[PDB]
Amino acid sequence: RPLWLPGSTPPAHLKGDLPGDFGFDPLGLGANAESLKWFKESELVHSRWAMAAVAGILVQEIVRPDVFWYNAGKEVESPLGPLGLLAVEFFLMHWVEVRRWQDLRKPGSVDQDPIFSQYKLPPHEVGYPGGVFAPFIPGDLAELKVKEIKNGRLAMLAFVGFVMAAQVTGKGPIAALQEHLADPWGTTIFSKAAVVPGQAVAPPCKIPASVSYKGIEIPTPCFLQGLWP
Amino acid sequence: RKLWAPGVVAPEYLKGDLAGDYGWDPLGLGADPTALKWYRQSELQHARWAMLGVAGVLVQEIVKPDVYFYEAGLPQNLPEPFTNINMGGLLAWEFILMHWVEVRRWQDYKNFGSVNEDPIFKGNKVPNPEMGYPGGIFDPFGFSNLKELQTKEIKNGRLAMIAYMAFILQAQATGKGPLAALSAHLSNPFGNNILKNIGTCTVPHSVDVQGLTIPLTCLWPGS
Amino acid sequence: LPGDFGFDPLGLLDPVNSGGFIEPKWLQYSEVIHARWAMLGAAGCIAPEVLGAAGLIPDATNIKWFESGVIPPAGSYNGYWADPYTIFFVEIVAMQFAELRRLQDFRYPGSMGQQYFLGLEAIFKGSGDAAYPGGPFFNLFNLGKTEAAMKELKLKEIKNGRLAMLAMLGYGAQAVMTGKGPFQNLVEHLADPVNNNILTNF
Amino acid sequence: MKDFTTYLSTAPVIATIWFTFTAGLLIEINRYFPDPLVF
Amino acid sequence: VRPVWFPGNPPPAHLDGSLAGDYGFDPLFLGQEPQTLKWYVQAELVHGRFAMLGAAGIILTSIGAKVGLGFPEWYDAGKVVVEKNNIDFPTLMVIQFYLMGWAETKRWYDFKNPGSQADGSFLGFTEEFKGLENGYPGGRFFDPMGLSRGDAAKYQEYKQKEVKNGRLAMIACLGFAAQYAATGKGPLDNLADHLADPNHVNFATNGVSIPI
Secondary structure (H helix, E strand, C coil): CCCCCCCCCCHHHHCCCCCCCCCCCCCCCCHHHEEEEEEHHHHHHHHHHHHHHHHHEEEEECCCCCCCCCHHHHCCCHHHCCCHHHHHHHHHHHHHHHHHEEEEEEEECCCCCCCCCCCCCCCCCCEECCCCCCCCCCCCHHHHHHHHHHHHHHHHHHHHHHHHHHHHHCCCCCHHHHHHHCCCCCCCCCCCEEECCEEEEECCCCCCCEEECCCECCCCCCCCHHHCE | CCCCCCCCCCCCCCCCCCCCCCCCCCHHHHHHHHHHHHHHHHEEEHHHHHHHHHHHHHHHHHHHCCCCHHHHHCCCCCCCCCCCCCCCHHHHHHHHHHHHHHHHHHHHHHCCCCCECCCCCHHHHHHCCCCCCCHHHHHCCCCCCCHHHHHHHHHHHHHCCCCCHHHHHHHHHHHCHHHHHHHHHHHHHCCCHHHCCCCCCCCCCCCCCCEEEECCCCCCCCC | CCCCCCCCCCCCCCCCCEEEEHHHHHHHHHHHHHHHHHHHHHHHHHHHHHHHHHHCCCCCCCCCHHHHCCCCHHHHCCCCCCCCCHHHHHHHHHHHHHHHHCCCCHHHHCCCCCCCCCCCCCHHHCCCCCCCHHHHHHHHCCCCCHHHHHHHHHHHHHHHHHHHHHHHHHHHHHHHHHHCCHHHHHHHHHHHCCCCCCCCCC | CCCHHHHHHCHHCCCHHHHHHHHHHHHHHHHHCCCCCCC | CCCCCCCCCCCCCCCCCCCCCCCCCCCCCCCCHHHHHHHHHHHHHHHHHHHHHHHHHHHHHHHHHHHHCCCHHHHHHHHHHHHHHCCCCCHHHHHHHHHHHHHHHHHHHHCCCCCCCHHHCCCCCCCCCCCCCEECCCCCCCCCCCCCCHHHHHHHHHHHHHHHHHHHHHHHHHHHHHHHHHHCCCCHHHHHHHHHCCCCCCCCHHCCCCCC
């Protein structure tokens, strides 16, 4: 079995049934199956969120450059009332999330379109609605799920590294890429900072301070500033 | 069998099965077998490393007899192609690749026979007969007898460890390469010796790198 | 037994009703302990003076032993890489460990070779006798594999140690009276076995 | 240890400690609240 | 056979090695009695966890201080924050009192009666206030991640590590108290100082600790 370590031994509760495992849980927290399903769900959740996020940020930096995706929160504009937008947002989200959670806590219990009785989703797996939720399927879930989880974990890493690269350079990830390409040698946190018993150094942040939006003036500190190297 | 001293007795476990043995474990450290393998691996480690070290310092002292290897560590002390590189990226590449290969050797010691193949070009594997003895591609000419090979290896390696440490101390004292120190003892064996040079090392007391200064050290409070 | 010339006037070797640390084992144990200490002390006090007399060592060295600083009133040396008390601290903890484990032996033989001590436990089996552990360390070389030469070494150790204790007494007494180096006093009494004596120093 | 607990539950030592406690109570009382006459 | 706190001597009777951190150390036999011993177990656990809290907050704040983040020195921090804010010291104190009192009282009467606190007399919860062991209230709340309910072996190891780091944190916070009591400075400051000159930055240089 392909393992996250060549030549090592998987733990107890890890075998390989669920895709995306290769015997990795050094803390062995996958003991309780309840929390384990909980965490499978949560990891799928985060992976999908982050995949969507990186995709959107990338394509947007592409087509509409010079718009700091990080500062889109600030510099967005729309004639619609922001309060109404966030209201619709909250309510929509409360609904969808309570649906998914009610189904998790009680499997196969909400599978119907409660409006159109004709419409009702077939039986499926928690974390795998499908049917209408997956109408067209080329290939096999055997590979689809493994690719899903792989790409999702990778995209989580992508998103967080984008955030770091912004906090350190303020540049969009593509800008930072072109920068790295320009100087392969000097474009490294290595070439940016280091720590020694004599003295320590860290790169300064580009996210300036409390952002002054339309009256609120959001306090904008840094992520764990003092321990960046 | 000649032991490590005329008339001395050997410990029960020292049998010469490992080369360079003479029955010398005055502090019984070779009691546990696990730790014994650990320590043999490390001994070979240090012997080989110091062998390479004396080799390098020697050949460079010969070819460019002005570098003063003890000070060659500086970016200014770098050859034509690159002498003002970023120590940042230097450390980057170095640490990455070394951490890899060290984890490889570590998995080796942990499970002898575990990772013998090239994990990608799977038509590629080296058979390891002994812990710390890869061979195969690591032995391009396949000289493997192996016993006297190991004897000469371990013996010369211990001695090279000693020699390299000697070079370090002599450099701290006289601020000069072993070449210079030997020429000194030859110009005068009476003069040019530890009896005179003693009690004062030439430690230049915390030189400064591109970004900062590094604290400096001497083996004794000679200063 | 070694060094026994019947020299026990008050009869302290009386076995009956023994106890405390008035007990032949601990007694001779302490004897050889102090004897070895005195050997070391003779070497220590004597070395630097004659060493500077040979000039092989610097003149910053070779101050009279007591002028080290152990008694700062008697004079101290400076050039020590750290503070007197700085040294003294780690010195305390080190000897604490050493003496403690030695005593743990003396009270419970071999009982320092069981709890994990970095593999140095076969070294700490010693023997069934304090002051004579042996083991791979405390006997590097098998010197005295015969018991005749063994006891020979034992007696030699005893005589040498008692004599060295007497030597330490002499060192202290002279350095108090004349306030000079013992080596100084040697050179003096050699200049005059007649005019350089304790009688002269009155 | 239990022997010790019993020794402390012995009588005169208990009388002692109770008296000490009361006396320290009243001395501190007078310390922080000097010169009481009425109320 | 287990490594004694003091090699060579045998351990006491009421000390065996059943609980984590047992190295046979009760030279004063305070745990001769089972009830008192178990009580002491719980007390040591509580105090060690508190010390862990203390050390963590201290070190964080001290880093924030030394690096230019404007974080006050801990021993000043309470005063400075109550001053920077419009908070009322007695109000803070009394609310904190309320809370710690209620929770600690629950713990107290659970030590008294081992299981009466999970009866569901509380709002609607049951066994979520049920102690797994003395001083080990492992439940859905005090162990939502359920480490205790898997690999009891690694769990015991974790108990070992817990008491270990707890005694470490206790001695650490005492150390910090001492560092300030001596130098009047930040412990991280004094740290960098000993870094500067171990040969000449120490209590022996303070001359206060050792009064010579």
